[PDB]
């Protein structure tokens, strides 16, 4: 049962909840993982690993993964909750050093991963052990592709570490802007390509039919989170939140700005049943009877269906994981997953 400020029922009635079959061992195998990269406290795994959901997150969105790809995906995912666990950490104890060298070392490990394998720090050692399987899925250019989009991410997140500590809320469109880099859009874009087993050309996956609903899918994804994040945002001190900047810079109240939110998202799912038909007229298309155009085909194909799996895993995430239950937190600020 769906909080009503918080219900979507054309997600509920017309996108259909999946479920990769790997899950139950990709929940386990995370989990390991976490304990084994020594990522989160031995005791916080066993507590609360299962109950935040990151692995049925990427389960209910990767559909047709190969088993290794998905595992290697879900690690990965697992890592970046951590990691924004740790820039928050950073910010409210005010360590700018240690960001500062946290960043760094993200952008050199991103290059080269097989170097950072057993760095002293557990998150530089971790995400490199992910990010090097990733790497070892599709050629060369795919995996510059990631990097280039990764690097960006990583400064994004420095724009924020810079915005809260000097308290700055960033206008509508400037958050706009902002969240589609603090959000990942276009790693998780990228992500559909191992997980169908085709690098699509440029020409391909700049085609507007596959941008714009790649687009739409994630513009949800961050806007769902940001409605459904707000309450333990709020209880944080976190100022990045399309209903945070609505309240600062157009005075909206609390309320009118839950209703502003709500309504974008409703609009992304509309505008993408729109575009998803053209895009998979375009699917359509590539199969014009040769080998690498049936390839082409089942691969846009598969993309565009986990473009729409992310609406509806994003969705029950937000209602499943414990990530988001600050009502039921001894000290609302203060998440019991994170290290304090
Ligand atoms: C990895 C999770 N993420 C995305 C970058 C950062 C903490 C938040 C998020 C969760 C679920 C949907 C959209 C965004
Ligand atoms: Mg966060
Ligand atoms: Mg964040
Ligand atoms: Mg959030």
Redesign the pocket.
């Known amino acids: 049962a769906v909080p009503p400020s918080l219900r979507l029922p054309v997600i509920e009635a017309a996108f259909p909840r999946q479920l990769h079959p790997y899950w139950p061992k990709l929940q386990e195998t995370t989990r390991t993982w976490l304990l084994e990269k020594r990522l989160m406290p031995a005791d916080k795994v066993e507590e609360y690993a299962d109950g935040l959901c990151y692995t049925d997150?990427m389960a209910g969105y990767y559909l047709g993964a190969p088993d290794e790809v998905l595992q290697a995906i879900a690690d990965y995912?697992a890592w970046?909750?951590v990691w924004?666990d740790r820039h928050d950490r950073d910010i409210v104890h005010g360590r700018a050093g240690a960001w500062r060298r946290l960043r760094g070392l993200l952008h050199t490990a991103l290059d080269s991963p097989g170097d950072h394998l057993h760095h002293e720090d557990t998150l530089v050692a971790g995400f490199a052990d992910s990010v090097r399987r990733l790497y070892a899925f599709l050629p060369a250019t795919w995996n510059a592709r990631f990097a280039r989009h990764f690097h960006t991410v990583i400064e994004a997140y420095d724009r924020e570490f810079h915005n809260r500590t000097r308290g700055i809320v960033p206008g509508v469109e400037e958050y706009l802007e902002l969240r589609r880099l603090?959000?990942?859009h276009w790693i998780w874009t990228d992500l559909l390509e191992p997980s169908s087993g085709c690098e699509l050309p440029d020409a391909v996956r700049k085609h507007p039919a596959y941008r714009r609903a790649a687009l739409l899918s994630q513009e949800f994804?961050?806007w769902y989170?940001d409605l459904c994040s707000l309450p333990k945002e709020i209880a944080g001190d976190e100022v990045h939140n399309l209903g945070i900047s609505l309240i600062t810079h157009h005075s909206l109240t609390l309320e009118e700005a839950i209703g502003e939110v709500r309504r974008r998202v409703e609009e992304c799912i509309t505008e993408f049943l729109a575009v998803e038909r053209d895009a998979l007229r375009f699917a359509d298309e590539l199969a014009d009877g040769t080998v690498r155009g049936k390839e082409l085909s089942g691969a846009v194909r598969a993309n565009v269906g986990n473009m729409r799996n992310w609406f509806s895993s994003?969705y029950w995430?937000h209602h499943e994981s414990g990530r988001y239950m600050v009502d039921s937190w001894d000290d609302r600020s203060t998440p019991p997953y994170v290290n304090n």
């Open positions: 997150l995912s970046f909750f924004d603090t959000s990942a994804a961050a989170n994003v995430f």
